[PDB]
């Protein structure tokens, strides 16, 4: 059995190799030297010693012009000395390489987590098809073409910068083809990933389990009204959170508190939340936000989404979603960062049109568009002819309402699998969000939701 | 376990796995009917082989417990492991002996050149350089012969580990492959079998030319792909590729 399947650890290793190749070329060169110490180094040492052998039997031990053999002998001496220094230094080099890899390991773990969360977005919706090459493009973009990496060279701030833009670019590239109500879900997943990544902060696994499923434990026996301002279902929510060790004394606190009622009727209670959780050590902002999120899930669950947004701000940086609020700017997305191999799949909610976006973008980038309706069989023929002619020149062929015939999309995906002669060629597929669109096409193309 | 021990001993009888200087450690019990109370080097190696097989069953069962997705292990796997061990051991010993005899031939040739220099003296300024370079090359090659002597003792465990990886550590992802390799390494260390510390399998089992050809033939540079290519090269049972993409094809 020879298995090529990518997994968590395979992606961790690949990410670590790539980041240690890019960020620390000297450490990667030391790695290569270590690997060739067992291999190629003694091999070409033997090859040059053999070279000295044929030089010796060619010169026949000449003495009148001795430099011909002296140069070879001193070259052998120098290479042998270099190999001796490398072998004598194997332990310091290996421990330094190990320390450097430990420095860059959380990034690789986060990258594997981000990919396998992104890959598992199929459950949320059928349109969330992402390939490995998509995430590798995200990684290659955040490594090389990172504007925030142009100036910093300290190799210690650079890691934090790389991680931050990694998370930001992953969200920006995934959420642009993902429903609006799913933006908060992906942001929470990324926030949990970074919370696992960050050092000095507890995992809060018990609080997460309570937040997801722990509120649904069976505690029917023991439901009491508490204060008249606290309703019965909020009372049982109080009971379930009193199961949690952090919030054991909610009931006594809410009888003690007299300003709790007005907060319970607040327009946006999440903005200013009373301190209820009992903890001796003052919790870090993240833990405080966790406690606040659990209480918002208990009291006033209608503010769950905005409290989750404030959590994403406190964990994944403020204005982490601000890229989504600004109007979508697809001229940069198509001009760069999109290969002509990948077609731009325009998916729109039923009852909406998205061709105006590509039209006015082409107007902004003064580019000809071969817009073709796909309904007719002559539509099929002219679409194929337009693709064949445009790959030769670079015209931006744009199909519309292409979800009607999935088999032709089988054919189109198979055709685009073959390489394109022109780099400036772009392809656009306007389609409706229905479950008959090819999964292979969705995986092989960049998806935009409108 | 007795059957595996017996077949491993009978198949590894041809290989020269005798080290008189091998000192017997404590513990490391796998087969419960070991012929001597202090095992010999060959018997310890056969015990390590049967342990590799048993611990592959253990790893498969624990994978089945924690999420299933396991392939059954058959005695054909054990025979393939032993065949890989034998062939790899023979190849590496043959290359080492050939390099040693080449070094000896070179020693005689450089000695003849020394005779030529001695006859030629009987310019002195170049002769001093020739003699000092001769001396330096002399100790360099003496240490080369000695490090070849040192490498020879270490060939047994390394080929065992590499054969176990080639034959057994398939269908298994990177983490499981590394866990199996480190468990086998810990067993060899507890059995006091001299294998090269912190070895990387790839360069020991593949040349620079082979890896260059693999990269030129559209192979990814990831370590997992390199190990899979090594398995695809040094195979006895015809390979079965599980590739979600078409990169392996």
From Swiss-Prot, chain A:
Subcellular localization, as worded in the UniProt entry: Cytoplasm, Cytoskeleton
Region of interest: AAA 6: 308-450
Stretches of the chain forming a coiled coil according to its record: 40-103
Assembly with partners or alone: Homodimer. The cytoplasmic dynein 1 complex consists of two catalytic heavy chains (HCs) and a number of non-catalytic subunits presented by intermediate chains (ICs), light intermediate chains (LICs) and light chains (LCs); the composition seems to vary in respect to the IC, LIC and LC composition. The heavy chain homodimer serves as a scaffold for the probable homodimeric assembly of the respective non-catalytic subunits. The ICs and LICs bind directly to the HC dimer and dynein LCs assemble on the IC dimer. Interacts with DYNC1LI1; DYNC1LI1 and DYNC1LI2 bind mutually exclusive to DYNC1H1.
Role noted for this protein: Cytoplasmic dynein 1 acts as a motor for the intracellular retrograde motility of vesicles and organelles along microtubules. Dynein has ATPase activity; the force-producing power stroke is thought to occur on release of ADP. Plays a role in mitotic spindle assembly and metaphase plate congression.
Disease: Charcot-Marie-Tooth disease, axonal, type 2O: An axonal form of Charcot-Marie-Tooth disease, a disorder of the peripheral nervous system, characterized by progressive weakness and atrophy, initially of the peroneal muscles and later of the distal muscles of the arms. Charcot-Marie-Tooth disease is classified in two main groups on the basis of electrophysiologic properties and histopathology: primary peripheral demyelinating neuropathies (designated CMT1 when they are dominantly inherited) and primary peripheral axonal neuropathies (CMT2).
Family of this protein: Belongs to the dynein heavy chain family.
Domain notes: Dynein heavy chains probably consist of an N-terminal stem (which binds cargo and interacts with other dynein components), and the head or motor domain. The motor contains six tandemly-linked AAA domains in the head, which form a ring. A stalk-like structure (formed by two of the coiled coil domains) protrudes between AAA 4 and AAA 5 and terminates in a microtubule-binding site. A seventh domain may also contribute to this ring; it is not clear whether the N-terminus or the C-terminus forms this extra domain.
Identification of the protein by name: Cytoplasmic dynein 1 heavy chain 1
Gene: DYNC1H1
Residue range from the parent sequence: 3698 to 4147 of 4646
From Swiss-Prot, chain B:
Positions where N6-acetyllysine occurs in the chain: 132
Subcellular location(s) per record: Cytoplasm, Cytoskeleton
Top-level taxon of the source organism: Eukaryota
Family statement: Belongs to the dynein heavy chain family.
Disease implicated: Charcot-Marie-Tooth disease, axonal, type 2O: An axonal form of Charcot-Marie-Tooth disease, a disorder of the peripheral nervous system, characterized by progressive weakness and atrophy, initially of the peroneal muscles and later of the distal muscles of the arms. Charcot-Marie-Tooth disease is classified in two main groups on the basis of electrophysiologic properties and histopathology: primary peripheral demyelinating neuropathies (designated CMT1 when they are dominantly inherited) and primary peripheral axonal neuropathies (CMT2).
Biological role stated in the UniProt entry: Cytoplasmic dynein 1 acts as a motor for the intracellular retrograde motility of vesicles and organelles along microtubules. Dynein has ATPase activity; the force-producing power stroke is thought to occur on release of ADP. Plays a role in mitotic spindle assembly and metaphase plate congression.
Subunit annotation: Homodimer. The cytoplasmic dynein 1 complex consists of two catalytic heavy chains (HCs) and a number of non-catalytic subunits presented by intermediate chains (ICs), light intermediate chains (LICs) and light chains (LCs); the composition seems to vary in respect to the IC, LIC and LC composition. The heavy chain homodimer serves as a scaffold for the probable homodimeric assembly of the respective non-catalytic subunits. The ICs and LICs bind directly to the HC dimer and dynein LCs assemble on the IC dimer. Interacts with DYNC1LI1; DYNC1LI1 and DYNC1LI2 bind mutually exclusive to DYNC1H1.
Notes on the domains: Dynein heavy chains probably consist of an N-terminal stem (which binds cargo and interacts with other dynein components), and the head or motor domain. The motor contains six tandemly-linked AAA domains in the head, which form a ring. A stalk-like structure (formed by two of the coiled coil domains) protrudes between AAA 4 and AAA 5 and terminates in a microtubule-binding site. A seventh domain may also contribute to this ring; it is not clear whether the N-terminus or the C-terminus forms this extra domain.
Protein known as: Cytoplasmic dynein 1 heavy chain 1
First and last residues shown, out of full length: 3099 to 3597 of 4646
